[model samples]
Target: PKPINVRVTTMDAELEFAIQPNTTGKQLFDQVVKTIGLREVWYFGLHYVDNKGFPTWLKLDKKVSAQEVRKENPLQFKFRAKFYPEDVAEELIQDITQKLFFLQVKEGILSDEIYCPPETAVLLGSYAVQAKFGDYNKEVHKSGYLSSERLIPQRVMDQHKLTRDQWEDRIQVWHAEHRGMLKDNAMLEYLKIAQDLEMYGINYFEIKNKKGTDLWLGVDALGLNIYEKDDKLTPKIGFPWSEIRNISFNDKKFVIKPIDKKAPDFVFYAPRLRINKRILQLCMGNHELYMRRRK
Candidate 1:
């Protein structure tokens, strides 16, 4: 059967491809979405604004082609948009307000005119923040500080010593940053924080590289980590569970040391997840709306 084809886009550009979920979502959104092209639509034209005021919409560059995909296979496509932040300069901040403001544009999927173009590029976000704030990733590294923690968590506490004061100066921050610490409802808080963070945009954006371009260029959700034995954090088999070296348009392949000493001798193809030439993970997350949508 031919794999499913999807178009994906970000950085306000169009990219298309095919995804082989038979292996993983990383490949599905990245490769498959790219082959089908992304710019062709906006979050597949899907948009919703729950009672909480959080919203999401499909975003792609143009159109992705997956003729490269085989015929008939079980697969699904995800559509999403880049987030906005407030910490950025006024110009940058204003841009996100304007763009994300229009994410809820008319429900036109294939119509390019329906969606407003994003002003600034480089989705500035920090997963480390989402992981820590959501308590989804509680693995405390030996570094004492949660090395894998997201900087966004800092917002929970206004305790940044950066602002020293004379009136018993000591800013108070809520939600003590700790491991396995669930500050809010398991799901509800997740959604609120995810959406709240949107006002701050993101800190970084990147994806793995395969061949020359992004392993697959599409939109996808956050890292879906499945718990392993002894509560070990294991990566979702297909979805992009970890950050790929996250190359750019100019960067390509690189030498990687696998976790296992003896894996295989085959040349590592693509940047991240790909099966039978299908991309799986898309390394995308709408942190702002994630928490809001969780519960």
Candidate 2:
């Protein structure tokens, strides 16, 4: 067998490489990610296109040489994130990373190719409808991209119609992506940020919370969460707006005091923090709103 030319498409750019005799798919993927400097590496994977044009994820531990993929022309490999996210907090806590994931969801929605949990799709459709059409008006069908695509549950489009089974499959994909976010406290806030994001040309800010264990903080309208930097799902703690007493940072220290008198205060010393004011604002703002509603 001769060296095969592989076409690799990442979230960023696409590049071509020669797959040598001893090369595995995982090895090839590493080169692509390293060459492009992709920091979010855990979520991405490589896939090869079959004769039927179906792209399949290459097993990381398997050998590519053993797989019989189309090799006459360049082997197509897509470096894409797995649609399913086990932990919304872990997977999409960062403003930028979450936004990136949402855009991908948006793409799936517009293409009518989204296969998510039925409940997840229903909820996402609600947000999509609201964002695009301004409200959930049953009589009114706000037509635009993916025209006739209703946002509410049991939404069916007439154009380019798909079979019932095919549509079911698409719904399953939507469920996969919604694994972590459907019931999250930050779901609403996540929807708000995703309302107006461009498909391409988006840069996410990097805010690394330097701590004893490198924590990442996520703040939404509902609350604030402390998560493991490597995996957002691995949370150290969370502070809901109603439970948060105060948030103050100064003199190389960050502190969070809970409303519960029994719960001891949380203080971080000599912390490397970023994106504080906005986070504080959200926490404080939500608390204020809660305060106003009390009868």
Candidate 3:
């Protein structure tokens, strides 16, 4: 089939729900609480070094930044469904990437990690992040970004107004992108994926992290973002980035301007990494890896 110029609706919208422009974030969060309910959460932060020279960034070295530790880590995200079923939650988490890509929802979530939010808009850990570091220097430093929870609100669907089929299409495309030709390989465990698929649409895919933190993922349809996934580690969802991550939430370092890259807005790739032990966690979403399946 030959491709041609496609006429599309030019109704550029940040979110599906009608929102009061220039409203304070607190107002936005209030609307979300009224719409969606809340959830609990906790988690460890990899506390890795960054592309930037923030050598002490995200390190949960608690002994140093007591105020920050109290402020960072253990984020609180909001959700449409308040329960945490493994399958169901995983499904929703996967959708975090999709929700933002399609501008369906403005919120996202992760669990079992440390977090804190400072008054400054730097993306802080949603929960209290604990770490060991900085004998000479402060092991703990409060990231200038606001907590992820502060960035997003609940009732994502209510705000986005995503159609059932449109939302399903996003899932289907994601599944196909992850699992092709129904085959498995080293990149992804196809059988596990199949099992996940089996339970995916069944409402069995509940979010566990949500059970811990009210902090969820938020997104815009096709706009500039502060960060993106590497795509190698984080397969299902790319290692995400935010002004919330790199810049002060108050001093946001992004502007929604003309689209430059051909890539999808808010795009990222999940890549896998080997930690100290044999335990490997999908920490990055790079450009090379694929989803895993069974032999």
Candidate 4:
């Protein structure tokens, strides 16, 4: 008769549900979707941080308790976008889905999950301003109006060493240029620009190179991108889905085999087995989507 409380963190709020220990992840997922009345469900998933600190997607086919979710207290999971559609403008059908994508992208930029250059940072910040307050009015949005809001990541501002007022002025100039753009359109524009960035739509995981140097493995729609540990903006190597023969993991070690018979396999080590599992899942999903896009 023991029931477990599962707390789901959604975009706007937290939802709590009581389910039997044997409940499948899909059952809980359906409840979450029903509560939100979301029709476009394939892009989203419930993720919980594994004991190794990696965000792991809840497997829908398995029993919730069998998935290593904490049996003590309330189990916590975050509802997040699991995959990015090839083209948001073309693929996303619903207004709510578009908004969800926008919000998640905005959060990713602000949190430094997606790196933005200073120039692009100010540009995106301007779009956010336009989306939030509509056309920027000189009198209403007077000096220091942006002080209360954080549009760009603090690291960008720190790296540039520009005063807040200076950044605000740049943002305001771009904001003013977006005249006549509606809130939703401004948000769309923001995403369109962000999508062109190198780091856009990438799920990055930290790993170690053969020499034990730290690096990042990025999985995206097109391929796998390897980035230096310190430089998140530029990739050091790229392995397109078409050129990859297969991917497999043994414990923390991950191997990527190339399609070319002569090419050497790429090997790296993740921090934990859990991380390797998530990486493999993302790679497989991305590869499948990549192939489908060509068909």
Candidate 5:
């Protein structure tokens, strides 16, 4: 059989290649990744709308028959970054409003058109107060001479302490003093915060493996990565879709079979029947969405 040429488009760039019935989505995506020079490429995926008008991630491990993939010059598949950081609080110390604004600026630098939602724009207006002016004073004047009444606001109840509005004004005032100090350092810090904030957009789910260890499971363009709840600096385990042989789940137990002969069956529990069902759905959904490699 003659090999069919397929075109892949990503990050505003395009690449064309050949795919035989034996060819898999991983092959096509890797070629596209190389042509586009993607260094951090795991979360990026190649997708196209199917005949049923459904958007589908190209399954990497499955063979693409002639009818399954489009064949022609100039036609292309759109590549997308599907996952976002799931825990904004863990990665970003800044308030959600500030984080939202910072993310837009970061996206702009990535060459994507910068857009701020109306809600976030209004919120950013509040942040502008702190960004331009600064933060509040740490010390409070002592009123009671005998007891040393320089009462820390933390000691007072919320209502008794400075109001939220008052706090905002104080923060602005504090920032006003050192606004221009270390402008370069501010950029570096912002970039670092953004980097730490990467996983905040991912949709994460919890599961307990047979070892009775709790973990988070999430999928990116390339594979599934499990992270320890407290320490997620590195994946406890990474299962690339290309390397997984099969997966199935029910309302209580989930199972994954790896392609490696030495690897044992991966089994885990989801606690509740509903949770189990949800995790099963997530696994199947993501496998459909992000799985690639030859099946």
Candidate 6:
């Protein structure tokens, strides 16, 4: 059998690997991890897009060719954070792992996947700058220092009507305030502030309610959040880990049983069974962490 060329996209770069046609997801994952020198492996996973344009996690135990991975010139897989720890400062041990988390969060903010207010955006950008550039030197970092770099989302800049220079000035002030802070500390501070954001660590899945209305289910460290398709920022309903009794799925139909005896179980239909499985796994992992935190 010929070797299959697999491209694994990471936060910073795309890694190419040639493996046997019978390679399992674990083998590819191990090869990627070995090359990247990632220590906290459990926090990340390899995902490939499905035919429906949905990102699906590659099953580690299964043969890569057996999975319904979207066919492309080169088999494509994305290496991404599969589980978010409660605290980056505590849980993440390796510097590489921390950097990966930082990159993911920064990417999220820039892409508008994580909603951030203009004011908060400046603060986050400043911490990011401090982490990357160290102390701000007047001679080195001038007024146009941030001209080429994308610190804030374009939509935010357009909505607020702030010029690049104006945002840079604001960010510089905040960056100066972070004087003497180490790069690792600055990165951790950025994540700490981000953790407070409502959409932080949220894994969103598009699904349909019992009424056949399109909705989004956001699973995170806190619990399950229901968001209307129109409004991604504010959740319409929230089920904290304590409030939820159970989560189960039958084919495409997913159910959430609440702890309250009188309340009806929350039911929604996923586009695919695979999505439901991922949702269930996330909920289980998050719920376990939530329970452990109380101990």
Number of the predicted model whose lDDT against the real structure is largest:
6
Ranking by lDDT: 6, 4, 2, 5, 1, 3
RMSD of each: 19.4, 16.6, 25.5, 2.6, 14.4, 2.5
Residues 146-166 of candidate 4: C-alpha lDDT, one tens digit per residue: 988888888897898789899
For residues 1-295, could you state the per-residue lDDT of candidate 5 as single tens digits? 6766677765445677776667777777777766655644544566775555655567667765532444344335777654433323332332432333344444443321222332232233333333432342344312211122111122221324454444444434434454454433343344444434324333466878889999877655356778897755467888876778887776578787899979988887767675665455445655664533233
Candidate 4 segments exceeding 4 Å error: 1-3, 50-54, 71-74, 208-214
- Residue-by-residue lDDT tens digits, candidate 6, 1-295: 8888889988887998687879999999999998999978877899999777887889899999888888886889999888788887778888788888988998999999898999999999999999989999889898788778889977789898678889999999999899999998888889888887878899999999999999999998878999999887899999999999888778899899999979889999999777888888888878987887688
Ten contiguous residues with the weakest lDDT in model 3:
123-132
Clashes of 2: 15
Error of 1 at 76 (Å): 17
Candidate 3 per-residue C-alpha lDDT over 191-230 given as tens digits, one digit per residue, 9 for 90 to 100: 1222232111111111112123211121211111221122
Error of 3 at 90 (Å): 8.6
- Candidate 2 matches the true fold with a TM-score of 0.39
> Model 1 has how many clashing residue pairs?
79
TM-score, prediction 3:
0.16
Tell me the lDDT of model 4 at 223. Answer: 88
Off by over 4 Å in 2: 52-54, 87-90, 93-100, 115-295
- Once model 6 is optimally superposed onto the true structure by TM-score, how far is the C-alpha of residue 170 displaced, in angstroms? 0.8
Checking candidate 4 for backbone clashes, the offending pairs are none
Over the stretch 134-210, how does candidate 1's per-residue lDDT look in tens digits? 44332642122433322222222233434222111110122223335442222222232333331122222223333
**Residue 53 of candidate 3: its Cα lDDT?**
25
Model 6 vs. true fold: TM: 0.88
